[PDB]
Amino acid sequence: LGRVDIHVWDGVYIRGR
């Protein structure tokens, strides 16, 4: 049921920063 944070953020992982 729990997770260790998601890679992507706000839909897609922003490039660089």
Short mmCIF file of the C-alpha atoms (twelve columns), coordinates in Angstrom:
data_MODEL
# 
_entry.id   MODEL 
# 
loop_
_atom_site.group_PDB 
_atom_site.id 
_atom_site.type_symbol 
_atom_site.label_atom_id 
_atom_site.label_alt_id 
_atom_site.label_comp_id 
_atom_site.label_asym_id 
_atom_site.label_seq_id 
_atom_site.Cartn_x 
_atom_site.Cartn_y 
_atom_site.Cartn_z 
_atom_site.pdbx_PDB_model_num 
ATOM 1  C CA . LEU A 1  0.000  0.000  0.000   1 
ATOM 2  C CA . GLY A 2  2.963  2.282  0.631   1 
ATOM 3  C CA . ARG A 3  5.799  3.373  -1.643  1 
ATOM 4  C CA . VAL A 4  9.234  5.005  -1.517  1 
ATOM 5  C CA . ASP A 5  8.555  8.250  -3.380  1 
ATOM 6  C CA . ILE A 6  7.894  8.441  -7.121  1 
ATOM 7  C CA . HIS A 7  10.571 9.111  -9.739  1 
ATOM 8  C CA . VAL A 8  8.473  11.372 -11.967 1 
ATOM 9  C CA . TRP A 9  7.113  14.659 -10.624 1 
ATOM 10 C CA . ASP A 10 4.080  16.680 -11.712 1 
ATOM 11 C CA . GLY A 11 3.507  14.156 -14.483 1 
ATOM 12 C CA . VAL A 12 7.001  13.955 -15.955 1 
ATOM 13 C CA . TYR A 13 10.504 14.202 -14.498 1 
ATOM 14 C CA . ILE A 14 11.814 17.656 -15.399 1 
ATOM 15 C CA . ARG A 15 15.144 17.727 -17.235 1 
ATOM 16 C CA . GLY A 16 18.258 18.707 -15.307 1 
ATOM 17 C CA . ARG A 17 16.812 20.670 -12.397 1 
# 
